[PDB]
Design a protein around this ligand. Structure first.
Ligand SMILES: NC(=O)c1nccnc1NCc1ccccc1C(F)(F)F
Ligand SMILES: NC(=O)c1nccnc1NCc1ccccc1C(F)(F)F
Ligand code: PRO
Ligand code: PRO
Ligand SMILES: [Sr+2]
Ligand SMILES: [Sr+2]
Ligand SMILES: [Zn+2]
Ligand SMILES: [Zn+2]
Lengths: 487, 498
């Protein structure tokens, strides 16, 4: 590893995603190859989240990638924001299509015409569908792997309900599942809140979100979104059902949509990665333990070399029995010192070393990836203390990252102390009037980069006392709003 | 119920089964179809089995970009020349025209192999075994048909690079065997292992192996899977090179393979086992293996007793889950039991379980097989054992009827007219073939020329399907092809296909 996180963050980031064998670059700007090491993280996320939403009655499906032009322009506010970043197909080989078709940036306009066909009676609701797929948002801002790419993987869940109390319940339920993905899996603390009128999803009523903080850059980044579309889409796609009471009074469904992307993997790297490679939380770590034989010299006993090789295979059989994910690295054309840095750069939480002097003494060495501690453990307590170190790494990664979040999430009441603490690489919660105009004025003023609205926190730090005005002086403060430079 | 009959009009029957089973919803873009949860669950079942198997082989999952530059796509000359007119091109983002059009992957050889070249610096980096589950686009000239032939479809593509041709060739047959297990052991569909002729092989590879399946209602075969040996045609173009320690200083090119399987699998399953009552799911891939419906709930039964009948249904549900049987308990109060029976018959659930009030105190229940309609009354105590035996027998007899259907419809002919007569009877034929491409086109036109079909069946000529690894009869020495102008090389399976 070359660069350092505190110095050049961008070059440290490009070095660790490639040398951990997560990312490979592509001759199309904004598109990055997910190599198996990275994809396994997305699979661990997918296995967790797929299991949790199917308890809620959501089923998996797959809708088409191509959107017709008529369907795209069905609702005018949704198509207004997404119009510039829609990639259009106009040709099949050398023959031009009669009408251009669009690659989905999101599937609201693809799925809901089918929702209208499937909802004939009251008994056809609720409809709860989810798909794992790729999406294209052609962003001409500078792309960055995982965090902001031209094409990314995600899940998008779309639900339709007869009542508003139903949709309101699911919006918060999905958001809590997104927080578990970041906190219980990726060991990343998040802030749950509500988007402002300026940053809310175009075509919905309100947008709940979770925000994460990247200390190395001082910038915040959105982790997940759970939108309440209300009736905005069902009115344009005619997802109707008869009212059980008044016959002939149409009722529009209440809808939600929610999405989680592979940016999770980038935020994992930017938060936990250090200057000696990736750091994987054990909950999503593809390989939790790697066993590496040590001390094998050219003149070593070939009979004992078989015995030392056998002892490494004895540890993996035991750790597999305790459902600890472990791979034994016995490749005979790589030095034991090369395997050290290889799995270090990859982020494996625990390295297990086996040497002749330790094998004969019924002992082995455990090397934690996060802190670098080396501990000699007897051969009997392998299934216990290694398991204990794994969740200790999980909690050490989380408490140290929450302590970073608590230090950099402070309160400010006027734009004097707001501009000061913002330029120190921290995010602040300021009294906000909620107007889309004052929101742009802050971002224009705080650049003299800028700071956007992140979320209106469900639980802010300080209780807004009556009489406190905004930072604009012309309007009262409606709520404390978390602000900061964002990705 | 179902209106169209599979034996009369197959197209309407297919369109009705895939919709009334809630598998397919249509879209406003031609050739693209919505995979509803009932169909998608099948694909996740195929995905779970095939993924566990290729990982035994050392293959790992990943995801490459769907966009291809024009230069990378055109590196292998004969590869792009075959796919060029069916590649979708992105030419503008919003209202802003792109300086250089980019392409949507019809397959990922040209996307991945620039990275393979970068990853292969020495012989220690080989082999490379990568696979991905993703979507591709093929804007084909043919008539689209849900599952079987769509403009966008879901699939898996595995791409492996080896240092020697022996290592690659072994993988080709290993994977083809897995595809055959997917069809024969999961979908209960018999298949024929063989290799494509020179005309039908993958453009850019050395040879193509394939599993061909047969659809008796249409008399047409369909390709279920391919496992290509690309040889070195791509590594010579993409510079996937290494230095063998035995041959000093000389550039060695990697031997590569690529293999694919698509969501066509679901349409073949539909076409083979479906009947005039709807879909028929093989129990190994059924989203729901057993559905439990409470019957006999009259308006005279008290709320206390009605809660006791639903509690017994849930008890049957919990017992079947403990023995790893995928079970749904349809306890909906807004649908009558008669609608529930037709609902789960159209969707193909292998076993319907009926629990009534008189049956509850009698300590018995009813099981109804979807494949035959046979009703059996089983004792409450022997439920976990009997139902598992029924599910297993359903899977066997589905495959057993399909295998006998294949046996009777796959015969051998040695003259051009006897091949013709058997071809127009709704069968596929193994004939002695000279192998050359120009003779296969002759067969394609001549069989379509001298075709005697029923009033309504359109003109369709026979094409190559595969050169079977184990043909029906040994080719006689000196035996000549069905054209009579060239010596025959092997028995080739011919017939009309999708
Ligand atoms: N080009 C991009 O914006 C992007 N690129 C790569 C990965 N994620 C991206 N967006 C984030 C996103 C998009 C859609 C729904 C939720 C989220 C969330 F992560 F913020 F929650
Ligand atoms: N547009 C199409 O050709 C198509 N559309 C939908 C589904 N499968 C399709 N082709 C079959 C196919 C393509 C690529 C690799 C293998 C196979 C196989 F299934 F035959 F093995
Ligand atoms: O793009 C979004 O944010 C919403 C949630 C996923 C589907 N559409
Ligand atoms: O399309 C094909 O047939 C090969 C195998 C999968 C990738 N390319
Ligand atoms: Sr062609
Ligand atoms: Sr040389
Ligand atoms: Zn203000
Ligand atoms: Zn011939």
């Amino acid at each position: 590893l070359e660069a350092k996180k505190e110095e050049n963050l961008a070059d440290w980031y490009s070095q660790v995603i490639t040398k951990s064998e997560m990312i490979e670059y592509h001759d199309i700007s904004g598109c990055y190859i997910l190599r198996p090491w990275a994809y396994a993280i997305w699979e661990a996320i997918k296995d967790f989240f797929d299991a949790e939403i199917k308890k809620l009655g959501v089923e998996n499906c797959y809708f088409p990638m191509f959107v017709s032009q008529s369907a795209l322009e069905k609702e005018k506010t949704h198509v207004a924001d997404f119009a510039p970043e829609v990639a259009w197909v106009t040709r099949s080989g050398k023959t031009e299509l009669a009408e251009p078709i669009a690659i989905r940036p999101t599937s609201e306009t693809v799925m809901y015409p089918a929702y209208a066909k499937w909802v004939q009676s009251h008994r056809d609701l609720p409809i709860k569908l989810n798909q794992w797929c790729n999406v294209v948002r052609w962003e001409f801002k500078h792309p960055q792997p995982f965090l902001r790419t031209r094409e990314f993987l995600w899940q998008e869940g779309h639900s339709a309900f007869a009542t508003m109390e139903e949709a309101a319940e699911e919006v918060l339920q999905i958001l809590d599942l997104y927080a578990q993905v970041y906190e219980e899996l990726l060991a990343i603390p998040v802030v749950k809140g509500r988007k402002t009128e300026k940053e809310k999803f175009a075509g919905g009523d309100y947008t709940t979100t979770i925000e994460a903080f990247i200390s190395a850059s001082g910038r915040a980044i959105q982790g997940g979104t759970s939108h309440h579309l209300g009736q905005n889409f069902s009115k344009m796609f005619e997802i109707v059902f008869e009212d059980p009471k008044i016959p002939g009074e149409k009722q529009f469904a209440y809808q939600n949509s929610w999405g989680l992307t592979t940016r999770t993997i980038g935020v994992m790297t930017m938060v936990h990665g250090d200057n000696m490679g990736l750091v994987l939380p054990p909950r999503v770590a593809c390989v939790q333990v790697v066993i590496i034989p040590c001390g094998i010299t050219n003149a070593l006993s070939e009979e004992d070399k078989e015995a030392l090789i056998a002892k490494c295979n004895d540890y993996r059989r035991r750790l597999l029995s305790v459902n600890i994910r472990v791979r034994a690295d016995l490749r005979d054309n790589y030095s034991p010192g090369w395997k050290f840095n290889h799995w270090e750069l990859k982020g494996v939480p625990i390295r297990l070393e086996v040497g002749p002097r330790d094998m004969k003494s019924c002992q082995f060495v455990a090397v934690r990836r996060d802190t670098g501690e080396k501990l000699t453990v007897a051969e009997n307590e392998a299934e216990t203390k290694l398991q204990a170190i794994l969740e200790d790494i999980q909690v050490t990664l989380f408490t140290r990252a929450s302590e970073d979040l608590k230090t950099h999430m402070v309160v400010a009441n006027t734009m004097e102390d707001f501009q000061k603490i913002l330029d120190s690489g921290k995010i602040v919660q300021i009294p906000f009037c909620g107007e889309i105009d004052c929101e742009d004025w802050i971002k224009k003023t705080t650049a003299r980069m800028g700071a956007k609205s992140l979320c209106i926190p469900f639980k802010p730090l300080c209780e807004l006392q009556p009489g406190a005005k905004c930072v604009c002086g012309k309007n009262p403060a409606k709520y404390y709003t978390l602000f900061g430079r964002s990705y």
